[PDB]
Ligand binder design. Structure first.
Ligand code: NA
Lengths: 36, 252, 10
């Protein structure tokens, strides 16, 4: 929606919400010269 | 997508298929940004030069899809559109400047393990992520090579490329509303979006709040995965205010 | 090549 998408925006039911990672997300994190 | 893999089940809950009712065909991709709004490229809807002007009851949006052509009987949900809004200043005449449009759904959708909205960036998120070298993720059911079609949603991660490199790579005039992404031939890794892929989301995961943001909309490219060429995408943050306006304007 | 969609939706 507006101001930085939604309410529950961007927290995928099958990964974040269950604390599971998809097979390549690492790749992404690792470049932001790494994650959380 | 060229040179990517098949996405995992529910890996892109915000991935929307723009589908032509008759002939029943995939037009483009799209992203779910709330339960009543979807975001896609304006060239998916209007391209006067090839005589393309899709109207509201010309289309359906399909969400929760994984399979390209199968009807995913109790997984995907199909919706009718209520309105189509193109950026009043989309340049179809020279460079596809402001290739962005919003479709407000005839009824809100219900979220599910397969259907979830993506976040739109805030000046600060946009500001710390949209940096060359940083990787984003594209998805779509489009062409597998420049010149088949996938059975499943595909995905590829690409690095954000420095503007000057961007420019230096084409003869099209590039505006601040655009960014390019792909690997350099020196780098020895590939992948790119391709026809059929347009309107899809380009997204990053915040390392601050672990959330997924849509940074880019799949816009145009000189051939798919050509060495020394890069995909181009509409710059979703540069356009948030426009997006903020119509939603406020006649939104959910 | 597209399997059929439900008329509830055409
Ligand atoms: Na390339």
């Amino acid at each position: 929606t507006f101001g930085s998408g939604e309410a529950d925006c961007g927290l995928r039911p099958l990964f974040e919400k269950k604390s599971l990672e998809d097979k390549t997300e690492r790749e992404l994190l690792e470049s932001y010269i790494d994650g959380r | 997508i060229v040179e990517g893999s098949d996405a995992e089940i529910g890996m892109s809950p915000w991935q929307v298929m723009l589908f032509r009712k008759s002939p029943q065909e995939l037009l483009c991709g799209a992203s779910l940004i709330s339960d009543r709004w979807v975001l896609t490229a304006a060239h998916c809807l209007l391209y006067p030069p090839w005589d393309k002007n899709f109207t509201e009851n010309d289309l359906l949006v399909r969400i929760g899809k994984h399979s390209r052509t199968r009807y995913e009987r109790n997984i995907e949900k199909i919706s009718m559109l209520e309105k189509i809004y193109i950026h009043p200043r989309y340049n179809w005449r020279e460079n596809l400047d402001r290739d962005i449009a919003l479709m407000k759904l005839k009824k809100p959708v219900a979220f599910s393990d397969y259907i979830h909205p993506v976040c739109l960036p805030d000046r600060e998120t946009a500001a710390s992520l949209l940096q060359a070298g940083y990787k984003g993720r594209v998805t779509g059911w489009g062409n597998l090579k420049e010149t088949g079609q996938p059975s499943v949603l595909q995905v590829v991660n690409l690095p954000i490329v420095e503007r000057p490199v961007c420019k230096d790579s084409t003869r099209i005039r590039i505006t601040d509303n655009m960014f390019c992404a792909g690997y350099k031939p020196d780098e020895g890794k590939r992948g790119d979006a391709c026809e059929g892929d347009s309107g899809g989301p380009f997204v990053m995961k915040s390392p601050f709040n672990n959330r997924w943001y849509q940074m880019g909309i799949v816009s145009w490219g000189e051939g798919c995965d050509r060495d020394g060429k890069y995909g181009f995408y509409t710059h979703v943050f540069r356009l948030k205010k426009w997006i903020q306006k119509v939603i406020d304007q006649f939104g959910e | 090549d597209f399997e059929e969609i439900p008329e509830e939706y055409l």
